[PDB]
Amino acid sequence: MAGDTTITIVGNLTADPELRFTPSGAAVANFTVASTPRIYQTGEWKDGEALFLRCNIWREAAENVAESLTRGARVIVSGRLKQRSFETREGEKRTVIEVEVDEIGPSLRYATAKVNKA
Amino acid sequence: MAGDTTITIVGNLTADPELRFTPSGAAVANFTVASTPRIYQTGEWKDGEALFLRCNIWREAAENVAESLTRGARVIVSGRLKQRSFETREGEKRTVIEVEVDEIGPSLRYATAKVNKA
Amino acid sequence: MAGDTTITIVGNLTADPELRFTPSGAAVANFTVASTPRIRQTGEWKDGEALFLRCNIWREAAENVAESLTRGARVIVSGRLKQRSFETREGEKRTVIEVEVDEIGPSLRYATAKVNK
Amino acid sequence: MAGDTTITIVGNLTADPELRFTPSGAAVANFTVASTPRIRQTGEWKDGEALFLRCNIWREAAENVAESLTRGARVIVSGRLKQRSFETREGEKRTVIEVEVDEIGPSLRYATAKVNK
């Protein structure tokens, strides 16, 4: 089976993708996708509950992300959910759900892109 | 558009679905779905990083859940992700991602069910 | 990073599942799910165009399915999409898109069910 | 709770997008995405059966798409599935499953792109 739990999110980047490198020399980009849904007999529609999702994406992919996308860029993200743990100074278990990004791209819904393949 | 961020999860219930009722008299069931993925040239496959996901489901749906599913039942869940906030005694912002369940069912992958419609 | 195109579908079975057996022993169920969305000032939300999808499930699940489910039953399905290239009486090719079902269950949205392992 | 059956698809465009215009003013792009999975002791993982899906996108996105993308380009797509009932030269009906695209972008898995709003 390999029931990796998959998700697709659409939204905007809270800020420029943070790019870092591990002990092992490997690349990583961190960024948070903020999704805003919408809901309808209210006259017009309305906005909705904003959802911030932290995103991790590794290696060559990550450099591409870093040098293509800015604060506020609207993107579309396919990936897997991961549960990270860590502790407070006082030893409290904290957990966050994060996204392991498999594919990501800018969204031509409201814009145009120039594709540089390889 | 109405970009509500959707997800499908498969896994087991950590324990019997907790059923409660609001001020307003409304029903709610709480339960946590634990997903276990798998990953392959290791000889055989292997298990993987377990993912606990807390789940909320409201109203008539909720009673149905409550009186159909037990600790450990393997289920399949379609729904939307929500970001809840709350604070520690000391005023720390804590956030959890939870699931608003739209459809759920037992999984005939390993079992049989008796359907009682209405 | 593999890439079978996954899908989740919710709807009603059109008919009692069709459970066959290969000479080579193994079990096979087939069926079809009608996803009827309830997605213009007239009320709140009224049916609109159903979608029908041939599903293929195999092995022990298939038995379990056939045994449990029933024309009309409401189900949730997680599968992958597959093209299978058909061949008509007249000829041509006539390719069609179908669903390798990974998991399936009856929806407790409008129903109870008792379970059996 | 609506219920258009949503899908996400990743693959390569088979051809330069086809951008038309309705007499009634409006824009329409059409194209087709080849989802090629890379999902038996021989290595690690080798191509295997592609899946091809006719996509329909509309309005301003369509312009934006046509303008930005290119035969061969790798894309991510979020859409809903629709049956549209066809009609062949010989007759019959010949129904086919397609994709109302909601969002689409080029994948930065193997590429850079500069963006323009």
Swiss-Prot record, chains A, B:
Superkingdom as given in the UniProt entry: Bacteria
Outcome of swapping N12S: 2-fold increase of stimulation of DnaB helicase activity
Domain (SSB): residue spans on this chain: 1-108
Gene Ontology annotations of biological process type: DNA damage response; DNA replication; response to antibiotic
One GO CC term, this protein: plasma membrane
Keyword DNA-binding among UniProt keywords: yes
GO molecular function terms attached to this record: enzyme activator activity; single-stranded DNA binding
DNA-binding is among the record's keywords: yes
Keywords noted in UniProt: DNA-binding
Transmembrane segments: none
Function: Binds single-stranded (ss)DNA. At low concentrations (0.02 to 0.16 uM), stimulates the 5'-3' helicase activity of DnaB. At higher concentrtions eventually totally inhibits DnaB helicase.
Subunit details: Homotetramer. Interacts with DnaB.
Protein name: Single-stranded DNA-binding protein
Native source organism of the sequence: Mycobacterium tuberculosis (strain ATCC 25618 / H37Rv)
Section of the entire sequence shown: 1 to 120 of 164
Swiss-Prot record, chains C, D:
Sample GO molecular function, one term: enzyme activator activity
Residues included from the entire protein: 1 to 119 of 164
UniProt source species: Mycobacterium tuberculosis (strain ATCC 25618 / H37Rv)
Protein name: Single-stranded DNA-binding protein
The SSB domain, residue ranges: 1-108
Origin: domain of life: Bacteria
Role description: Binds single-stranded (ss)DNA. At low concentrations (0.02 to 0.16 uM), stimulates the 5'-3' helicase activity of DnaB. At higher concentrtions eventually totally inhibits DnaB helicase.
Entry keyword set: DNA-binding
Any one GO BP annotation for this protein: response to antibiotic
A cellular-component GO term for this protein: plasma membrane
Subunit structure, as described in the record: Homotetramer. Interacts with DnaB.
